Design a protein around this ligand. Structure first.
Ligand SMILES: CCCCCCCCCC(=O)O
Ligand SMILES: CCCCCCCCCC(=O)O
Lengths: 39, 281, 247, 238, 247, 281, 39, 238, 49
């Protein structure tokens, strides 16, 4: 519980478990299917 | 594509494969995409319910540590004359710097902790004043100038006998995030500084000993630690390999001999068929 | 008032503590957030991107020459082409990679790794190679007949330029440690070796020596624990300009 | 199917019969500035076809000992066509970029180029504490060259550069690379003459080689700004 | 009792802290409130009032002469009459204004400004002027043909004595800073110039030199951040009588 | 006319205008009203949803800062003989004074913080007593007079080793608000003091070291900070430009040379067509 | 939460967002219409 | 429509055919003291028409080198008519004020006067630490003159004086200024002989000038107390 | 100007469209090649690589 009036004073926020690796690992316009030849 | 991940992915058992037109182990690195070959497609796997957590690698935790950002020793005596001014920056200590530089942009609030220590040239329990002087504001010229009255600037008074002083500086950039790297110049003319975004200018931290000098001199050291929190990060980057040279740029030279020499980052082995720590039985 | 008593630990400054603290600028209104491409929320996202292994870390190889392994047309059969030390704690081909660099900020690791190799010879060049992963216990194999007994993938050069060798997580314990003793039972991962399955065969006008570029990355079954300072950076003096910040 | 591609913008079009799919940086696509992210209050000009089109820069020659090339954006285009004119007459600009790198040879040639788009590629100088100067950074349409590609001329490494949006041109496989770049900055718009959002780097990780007849093998870069917007009209800083 | 432990920051005196504290006079009954004209609740209310710019800040101009710009009947065409440095951090015509003074107690600012000019010549005097705002990037324009390309308003003297030039908020970043480097990309606002559109024309008995008074104010889309001590006041000694307060 | 404002106003897109009888850019300064020309009427604008906050400029925050109002050093030894008396006023330190003087009337409670420091001519952990002596009450004449028994006056006892002492003085004016400025005389005769409203008379702050003197002498410095809160303000005023001369009046002289000289507040530039920090490319 | 018995001892009150600039910017008896000639 | 105006109070009236609307200080209007704000318990006298009417002071001449003029209220009226008598016979007074400043010339003259009503205008003395004396402040009906109008004779500035209720008399535009002042004080009533709630300042920011026949150009001030109330009756402090 | 970048390959041919871009509805086959009602512009071909 943050007792200060400014929210930026609060303790850390370690609850954001969202991820999207594909923006780094698969930034290709056409999705690559499992075993289908990529090219 | 986005989803909530709390544990490492499970493995599903797999069977023998002999299908024409299906080659999961073949890929095309040229597309820029990382291989999507799954373990289940490369070998026969068993089922494994993986309970390994992934919270210690959350960006908030990775960067959420108080790291040394400033260290300054000065003489407290009858005359840095009992005070100093530090133009704030996060590029002087390499451990913190390298981690922050793993990202292109960062948005975070910063918890600041100030630790003070003293040594005689018993120990006096002095009172210190740390004043935050924002850009464009006047900085003190003497241990006793009027500037210290701090009518608007935020100042914190603390004693050496108390726990380290602490306060949080909000995310204060004029942009939506700090620019860890900046491929541009700070001014409209051509002689400006390269690689320094004006937008990320914090200001000066002015620290003085409030007490008048004693009959003898002392060495006072002030250490400032910063811990980012409520963090958002964008566009990860290649980690620094060459030793840092300056706080004002990414200039490089490399170590005199491997590892991390400009000519060779990894240390040499005799040949590409030589196994360094080969098990000899 | 409320009767209280201070516990051991009172007054200490733990660098990994997590508490709220006084706002320096009351009523400050931070700049509105704006969408920015490429947000990363967990470091595991970064290590899943493959990066180049410095396999040719040998004397005589300078700069980028260290990032590619040259293979030539062989005169003999079943020839060993190269091996890769799977050392992450100790310096080696895997150290300066995304997975290697980030993992070194930790002490424990678990999960499968993937090595992808892209053949960069000419279109007219053909060949078949065998990439092998040997779980720990013995000496690194030096003959194909021995390496072939472990986990492997036979690679045929062709339209699809790259092949992936999965180094599945095979460990007795849940995690392995980045221990300074490379031969420790809680650290050694085994070996990766590459042999000709057939041979590199090219016509007269194609170059007779071709390069491979090897990449490595973690899979999504990966996990890292126990944060520590990385051994990859250090300083013995003030950086240029550091002291001037006080003038 | 993912080897052939046609890109059409404005009065310009490009086709390739040897592509390798194409990259959308961080899975994003360019777009105009929405009202809820805007800062500058003057009505912007959105020239569309006169600026959102392919501009082809002068080619460079891929030699046996080449170290690599780079072009900074928008600097490389700040003096080309109507995009250049809008940039000179306006204090603020915003846009994405469609990049197409071209390089063909024969089925007897080998070589591999890393084609990477680096956000905020702040260059470092070698063996000196003096920061790079204006002329070391602003090369314009001609672009620059890498001194030490191994560390990306910034003390890091090309080995890990794959963390950035990229593709490769492996002669044996493809003859072109395509990368779509969205606006990348911490501000909704910026002054185009003193800051470069992206740096296009083309580096030969595997040198050009062959035993067939030697021929000049060029590398050509075509760049199309996307969803251009300009604010703060005044006289030209030509 | 309650087990507790002191955190870093314990015992410190932060001048911007916000806590309750012991009442010195218990049961004290403050004087009843009474309505008083002119209550101000946000400093932004004050900076929206226009005040006089010291445009004629030149040697030879004393006191109030510095608050008015004299324009004369010209012999040549398209003549430049004056320009106004938009410096707020650095000393200049805008510094000693309501918006300037209050803004200087802060570090960041954002929003549109408005400059209003009142023609104070005689009724029989006529004329047309052009006021231009040039966004940053280059050198201040010195010819009407160049200035005219920026934001502007052509002013015709008449019954309505004053004209307003809006300096719209045109910035890449959300805020600008009151940085000591006037040429910084995060501080320079551009320029304001004034040229004759036609000419000041007056009859024989009207004075041939007339004055303009320029005012400036913030609009309601304005915002200020990061409070700091103002550079506009200081002391090097005790004020007279200060020490006597102890006698 | 009154309304709740939490963010800067948004901008609405505007079109071309060519209407007879409508001239939004023309105004009449003579009426005393500020121009009401909107950006949308001066130029063509786009729509902008402005999220910029306005809380940092709230009067409560603008004036809500602890500022130095009193600083006094005295010798603690065998004999200001180990104590001092300060006639309370907020006109001695210019940073606080200038800000308070931006208003005509002010109503607020005042948080008072007292910081003490010592120096030898180790450091003793002395006990001090700060007694509030209201108007008409007797002030102490010696470090040990009976007055310090403080039977009714509020007194606070604190140690140098403790955090700074702190307490709140309520809004105590005999009127509904303090008169920051007073165009009148304090008495019924003609020789009274001008510019000093009796109604705003607080009293005296008497501070002594409780401990008897030690074998050696020390210099003790007491700093008092004041932070107004629960603030109401009326009728803003022109900011002070000339340096202050006295705590008892608004007398002025001006700096010897610009800026802020009686003859010229802003520094000179060569001419009205000279641009001082012109960008040269 | 103020634990003292006197309300004036409480922490600051930073929640009054009411404004009326017009008492300073438009103190004219007759409201001035947008584009209509002020005089 | 907002250029002509007639003010009528008691047996007095004033018209102007060249006004510039009129100012109501802080958007308020004078009013009698309500029971919930009252302090003095004796029944007040509210003389109405005998005191709430226009009193015209002696005029002053606007010269080429004039620095400005000022009149403090209620001092300027403390010895005029029935308002003056009530002020002298009563310890306490309360009232608003309707101010009308007049100045006409020709269509060939130019000049601009700032007409501002300053609350609590505490004067400062120049180049001395000695505070202004009784005779430097209490000028009565004659009013005073500014020594250094540039800093409002108080170390601040006339440039920012517009933050106070005001109007301007710009010869080319209008010939009068009108300001309505409500009771302005921290107390419901006050002793009229030792404190002035308001100070009327008239300062020529743009000097009087012309090339036509020279004539004496006066500035005249008319002030009407409003909603006058007096308490604490006794003998006159005449 | 209007253009098409052509990559040689399986599909042997490329098409450059010369869109009708004229101020007037029609152009004339006038003997004056430089006339504003006749000149169509130019077509040029350069090596891209
Ligand atoms: C100690 C105060 C720190 C304030 C936040 C500084 C952020 C710097 C980010 C960077 O450019 O690396
Ligand atoms: C340190 C005690 C302060 C009590 C409140 C003083 C208010 C003074 C207001 C003023 O006239 O500027």
């Amino acid at each position: 519980i943050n007792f200060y009036k400014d929210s930026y004073a609060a303790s850390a926020s370690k609850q954001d478990f969202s991820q999207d690796p594909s923006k780094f690992t698969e930034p290709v316009v056409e999705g690559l299917k499992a075993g289908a030849p990529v090219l | 594509v986005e989803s909530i991940i709390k544990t490492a992915t499970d493995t599903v058992k797999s069977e023998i494969n002999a299908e024409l037109g299906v080659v999961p182990s073949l890929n095309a690195v040229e597309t820029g995409a990382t291989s999507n070959t799954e373990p289940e497609e490369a070998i026969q796997t068993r089922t494994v319910i993986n309970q390994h957590g992934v919270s210690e690698t959350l960006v908030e935790n990775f960067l959420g540590r108080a790291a040394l950002v400033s260290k300054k020793s000065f003489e407290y005596k009858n005359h840095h004359k009992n005070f100093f001014k530090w133009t704030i920056n996060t590029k002087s200590f390499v451990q913190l710097r390298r981690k922050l530089e793993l990202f292109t942009y960062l948005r975070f609030d910063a918890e600041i902790t100030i630790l003070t220590t003293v040594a005689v040239n018993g120990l006096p329990d002095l009172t210190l004043q740390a004043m935050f002087v924002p850009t464009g504001a006047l900085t003190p010229k003497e241990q006793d100038s009027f500037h210290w009255q701090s009518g608007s600037n935020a100042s914190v008074f603390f004693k050496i006998s108390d726990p380290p002083a602490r306060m949080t500086i909000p995310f204060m950039c004029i942009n939506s995030a700090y620019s860890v790297f900046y491929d541009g110049f700070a001014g409209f003319e051509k002689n400006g500084l390269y690689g320094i975004n004006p937008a990320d200018t914090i200001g000066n931290l002015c620290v003085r000993i409030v007490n008048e000098h004693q009959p003898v001199g002392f060495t006072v050291t002030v250490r400032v630690y910063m811990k980012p929190k409520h963090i958002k990060a964008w566009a990860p980057r290649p980690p620094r390999t060459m030793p840092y040279m300056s706080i004002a740029n990414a200039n490089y030279k490399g170590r005199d001999t491997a590892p991390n020499t400009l000519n060779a980052i990894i240390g040499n082995r005799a040949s590409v068929t030589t196994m360094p720590h080969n098990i000899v039985t | 008032g409320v009767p209280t008593y201070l516990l051991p630990g009172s007054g200490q400054f733990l660098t990994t503590d997590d508490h709220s603290s006084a706002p320096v600028l009351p009523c400050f209104n931070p700049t509105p957030e704006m969408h920015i491409p490429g947000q990363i929320r967990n470091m595991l996202e970064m290590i899943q991107v493959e990066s180049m292994m410095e396999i040719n870390n040998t004397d005589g190889a300078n700069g980028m020459e260290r990032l590619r392994v040259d293979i030539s047309v062989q005169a003999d059969l079943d020839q060993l082409l190269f091996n890769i030390p799977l050392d992450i704690q100790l310096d080696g081909p895997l150290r300066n990679t995304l997975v290697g660099n980030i993992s070194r900020y930790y002490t424990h690791w678990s999960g499968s790794l993937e090595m992808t190799f892209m053949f960069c010879g000419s279109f007219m060049a053909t060949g078949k190679l065998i990439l092998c992963y040997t779980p720990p216990g013995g000496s690194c194999p030096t003959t194909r007949e021995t390496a072939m007994l472990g986990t492997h993938i036979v690679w045929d050069f062709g339209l699809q330029s790259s092949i992936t060798l999965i180094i599945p997580w095979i460990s007795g314990s849940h995690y392995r440690m980045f221990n300074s003793d490379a031969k420790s039972t809680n650290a050694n991962v085994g070996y990766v070796t590459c042999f000709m399955q057939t041979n590199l065969i090219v016509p007269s006008e194609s170059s007779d020596t071709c390069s491979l570029i090897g990449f490595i990355a973690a899979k999504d079954d990966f996990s890292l624990r126990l944060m520590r300072d990385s051994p990859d950076i250090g300083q013995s003096n003030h950086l240029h300009g550091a002291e001037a910040a006080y003038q | 199917s993912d080897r052939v591609l046609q890109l059409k913008l404005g009065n310009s079009a490009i086709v390739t019969q040897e592509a390798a799919n194409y990259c959308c940086a961080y899975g994003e696509w360019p777009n105009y500035l929405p009202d809820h992210e805007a800062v500058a209050i003057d009505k912007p000009t959105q020239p569309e076809t006169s600026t959102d089109r392919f501009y082809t820069l002068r080619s460079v020659k891929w030699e046996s000992n080449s170290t690599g090339w780079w072009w900074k954006l928008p600097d490389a285009l700040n003096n080309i066509g109507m995009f250049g004119q809008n940039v000179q007459y306006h204090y603020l600009y915003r846009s994405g970029f469609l990049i197409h790198v071209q390089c063909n040879a024969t089925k007897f040639h080998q070589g591999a180029l890393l084609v990477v788009a680096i956000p905020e590629h702040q260059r470092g100088a070698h063996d000196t504490t003096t920061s790079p100067g204006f002329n070391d950074i602003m090369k314009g349409e001609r672009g620059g060259t890498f001194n030490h590609p191994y560390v990306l001329d910034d003390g890091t490494s090309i080995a890990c550069a794959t963390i950035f949006p990229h593709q490769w041109i492996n002669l044996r496989t493809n003859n072109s690379a395509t990368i779509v770049l969205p606006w990348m900055n911490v501000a909704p718009m910026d002054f185009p003459l003193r800051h470069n959002q992206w740096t296009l780097a083309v580096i030969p990780v595997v040198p050009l080689g062959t035993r067939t007849m030697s021929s000049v093998v060029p590398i050509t870069v075509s760049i199309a700004p996307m969803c251009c917007e300009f604010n703060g009209l005044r006289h030209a800083i030509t």
